[PDB]
Design a protein around this ligand. Structure first.
Ligand SMILES: Oc1c(Cl)cc(Cl)cc1Sc1cc(Cl)cc(Cl)c1O
Ligand SMILES: [Ca+2]
Ligand SMILES: [Ca+2]
Ligand SMILES: [Ca+2]
Ligand SMILES: [Ca+2]
Lengths: 115, 115, 115, 115
């Protein structure tokens, strides 16, 4: 599992469940092509987005749909989404965990990269 | 000053100086068109981006060039940039401050919206 | 102003106003003795805590009463308070800003140390 | 496992390994009595601090030795440690995960509380 996403809710102190996540990869013409998508589980984790074969070098964008998450909880948040944009696999295959910690007017994102 | 940006460096414990910031407004065809830009000052702040007359309701993207900032310090970064996307909504007088706290493999962003 | 404290609210996207802050200095017997205190202003800032003459090298603790802040807003918090513990070191002119970004089940703190 | 601690390094994008963690519980005389301690593994996780029987109601303090972590990496950090202070189990037993994200001049902490 080369790309995993974890989302936590800083208001409730819980995993953020059922958060939609869309991954894009920059194409040769510099547009964002759709790459993979999914939603977080009851643990706040999203596994199975991609495979070692599919997850080639490139510039990837992970768009976490934080607005829909907050709206479903009856909350009007500030951001449209949380975006993480990074170059992947430039020195060979790595495993990436993108973590996001959500508040209505704030978010933090961190990456854990392992070989 | 309806829109201000502040950037902090969590490695050195200092304002993030000379960071390029580009602001875009979402156009009717869903593209991002340039709206305002600048570089943070010695205090890590970027003032004078826009005026009340031109800062209308809409979806805005603030792109902070974190990768170039880290490279100028000789520090290896993860992200290509930090992207903060939000809707500006007229509800009485409102000033927007977008703050970003930068680390090489993590960033936090928050919005301070005051009257 | 050698020591300033700033507190932000990540749920409401606002300065955290009227937050009690107590500063302690570590004494020779390893106990924490009161040094300075106050409440954040309408801008979320607490100025005038100490003077350059009295703010000597040492270990300091900044206790932010986050629990009372959240209770006054009717929001259920996790932490009893936020504690920021650091050594002040004389190395040329130095001003210390301790910033805290508050959510009910999370907080971030950073130090901005300038000349 | 009712109390677990996870620590990540925001400079390297990795688990923070071999971080010492000391847990205290407030005694009847209002002093901090030692409760449990350990160090993070290669995954940045610390398991086995306590048991369901031992982890009674009370006010607990989790002190994460961030200064030693940074010093071992040849880095001079700002904070002495990262402290998390919270009331536990007041509405019955819960499971607590305390996560900490570390930078030399900044840290974030979050709690995930499950039933
Ligand atoms: O989701 C997390 C956040 Cl927001 C902060 C911290 Cl200090 C830990 C976690 S869990 C987690 C996050 C990442 Cl990037 C990698 C792994 Cl292996 C985790 O367990
Ligand atoms: Ca390559
Ligand atoms: Ca409107
Ligand atoms: Ca000294
Ligand atoms: Ca009870």
């Amino acid at each position: 599992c080369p790309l995993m996403v974890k989302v936590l809710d800083a208001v409730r102190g819980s995993p953020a469940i059922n958060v939609a996540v869309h991954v894009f990869r920059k194409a040769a013409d510099d547009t964002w092509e759709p790459f993979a998508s999914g939603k977080t589980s009851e643990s706040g984790e999203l596994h199975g987005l991609t495979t070692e074969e599919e997850f080639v070098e490139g510039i990837y964008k992970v768009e976490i749909d934080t607005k829909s998450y907050w709206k479903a909880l009856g909350i009007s948040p500030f951001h449209e989404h949380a975006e993480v944009v990074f170059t992947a696999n430039d020195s060979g295959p790595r495993r990436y965990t993108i973590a996001a910690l959500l508040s209505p007017y704030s978010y933090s994102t961190t990456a854990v990269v392992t070989n």
